[PDB]
């Protein structure tokens, strides 16, 4: 039988954990009120 050495095949998406500047609570969740003075 002939035989020969082989190996190291090349074989064997998601953009980033980071980027995507992440926003705050006053967006999709409850907003604590604003409380102006009295005049």
């Amino acid at each position: 039988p002939s035989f020969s050495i082989k190996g190291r095949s090349k074989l064997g998406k998601t953009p980033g954990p980071a980027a995507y500047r992440q926003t705050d609570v006053q967006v999709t969740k409850f907003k604590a009120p604003q409380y102006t003075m009295a005049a």
Binding site: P15, Q22, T28
Partner: protein
């Protein structure tokens, strides 16, 4: 190993979504609450722990009710408590209100969920977005959404399901505007926007399905069955299965021109067939009958370019060719002189499922036909001319221009609209 993130956006979408996810859950075998009492589920679901099959979706709505009801319903214990991103103020039928104003605030929380849903995926063959050419949430957001995803995720085929403005019936006064702008940000950032119009769905379920007074519910189940069919090959088994990447190379016939139609044909009234069962031969003809077209556009006034016929059920490999033959001979059905072929068969095995309490029978066959006929040219030409009437006397522009959209944009959109016109006209003029 095959995955498809589903971004249900806007009321329309979230609605078509709760109809599609029921159809999906049943087909696979999970009770509306996860917990299945196999690789099928994978395409549209992901297991996580002691039987908590959760879906691959991300419900998005700038308004907080259509998703609130999805959060306090029966499928509440299914969708991740974080995938159903709601919001605050609505989008007042304003492309600007979504794309430029309100919308620009949730885009982050939607694309980060999309990010997570895809790092857990191992083969995103294509996204499935569900929008409506009616208002901002469905138009503006889906635009921003597309643009970002287009570059952020990449060549992954983003296929979308859209509800086009009907040529007479409508629930808006500004729909001509909203829709035209959506195209300017879709004709270049999508691959196949399987369209549909309620007016025709309200006739399929009025001439065939003997059902008067149909509500939204009984108009999205049929949309669910079309989408279920185009995603059944990459979910169960088959003989000539078509991957999501082939519903493109074998349909879109030029750079743009990427808007397929739809025609599930064995739509049969519940109380009807007691001594009959449709056979491929006629089930095919049914989808081509100019009365099952779920998108209103005299299919005869044009030239069917390409055609994909997905057969689900006991469809035999050689009888689909019999059907294809006769159809090709039928004079009326005119196929362009450029495409000598013109069909793509998909014999899957799983028979169309039965929503427990709907309007569909248990037919052992199906023919979801996604067709690209020039006819749609006119089907959007109507909307275009409706735009003309309003814009002429700057009407309802005050509202959009006052949310961050240069009035110029409107005109530029009509330029891209009138482009797809000559394009559809051009992709027909018989070769000299």
């Amino acid at each position: 190993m095959r995955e498809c993130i589903s971004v249900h956006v806007g009321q329309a979408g979230v609605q078509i979504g709760n109809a599609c996810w029921e159809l999906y859950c049943l087909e696979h075998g999970i009770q509306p609450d996860g917990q299945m009492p196999d690789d099928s589920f994978n395409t549209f679901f992901s297991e996580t722990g002691a039987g908590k099959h959760v879906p691959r979706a991300v419900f998005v709505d700038l308004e907080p009710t259509v998703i609130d009801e999805v959060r306090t319903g029966t499928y509440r214990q299914l969708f991740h408590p974080e995938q159903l991103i709601t919001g605050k103020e609505d989008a007042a039928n304003n492309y600007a209100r979504g794309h430029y104003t309100i919308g620009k605030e949730l885009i982050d929380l939607v694309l980060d969920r999309i990010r997570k849903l895809a790092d857990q995926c191992t083969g995103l063959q294509g996204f499935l977005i569900f929008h409506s050419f009616g208002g901002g949430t469905g138009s503006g957001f889906t635009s921003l959404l597309m643009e970002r995803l287009s570059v952020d995720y990449g060549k992954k085929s983003k296929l979308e399901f859209s509800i086009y403005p009907a040529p007479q019936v409508s629930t808006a006064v500004v729909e001509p505007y909203n829709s035209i702008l959506t195209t300017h940000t879709t004709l270049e950032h999508s691959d196949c926007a399987f369209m549909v119009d309620n007016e025709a769905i309200y006739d399929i379920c009025r001439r065939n399905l003997d059902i008067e007074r149909p509500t939204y519910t009984n108009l999205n189940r049929l949309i669910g069955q079309i989408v279920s069919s185009i995603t059944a090959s990459l979910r169960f088994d088959g003989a000539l299965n078509v991957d999501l990447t082939e519903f493109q190379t074998n349909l879109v016939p030029y750079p743009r021109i990427h808007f397929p139609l739809a025609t599930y044909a064995p739509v049969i009234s519940a109380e009807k067939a007691y001594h009959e069962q449709l056979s491929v031969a006629e089930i095919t003809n049914a989808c081509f009958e100019p009365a099952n077209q779920m998108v209103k556009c005299d299919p005869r006034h044009g030239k069917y370019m390409a055609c994909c016929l997905l057969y689900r059920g006991d469809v035999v490999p050689k009888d689909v060719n019999a059907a294809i033959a006769t159809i090709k001979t039928k004079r009326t059905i005119q196929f362009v002189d450029w495409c000598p072929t013109g069909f793509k068969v998909g014999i899957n095995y799983q028979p169309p499922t039965v929503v427990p309490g709907g309007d569909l029978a248990k037919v052992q066959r199906a023919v979801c036909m996604l067709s690209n006929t020039t006819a749609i040219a006119e089907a959007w030409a109507r909307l275009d001319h409706k735009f003309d009437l309003m814009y002429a006397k700057r009407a309802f522009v005050h509202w959009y221009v006052g949310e961050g959209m240069e009035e110029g944009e409107f005109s530029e959109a009509r330029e891209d609209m009138a482009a797809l016109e000559k394009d559809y006209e051009e992709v027909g003029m018989d070769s000299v």
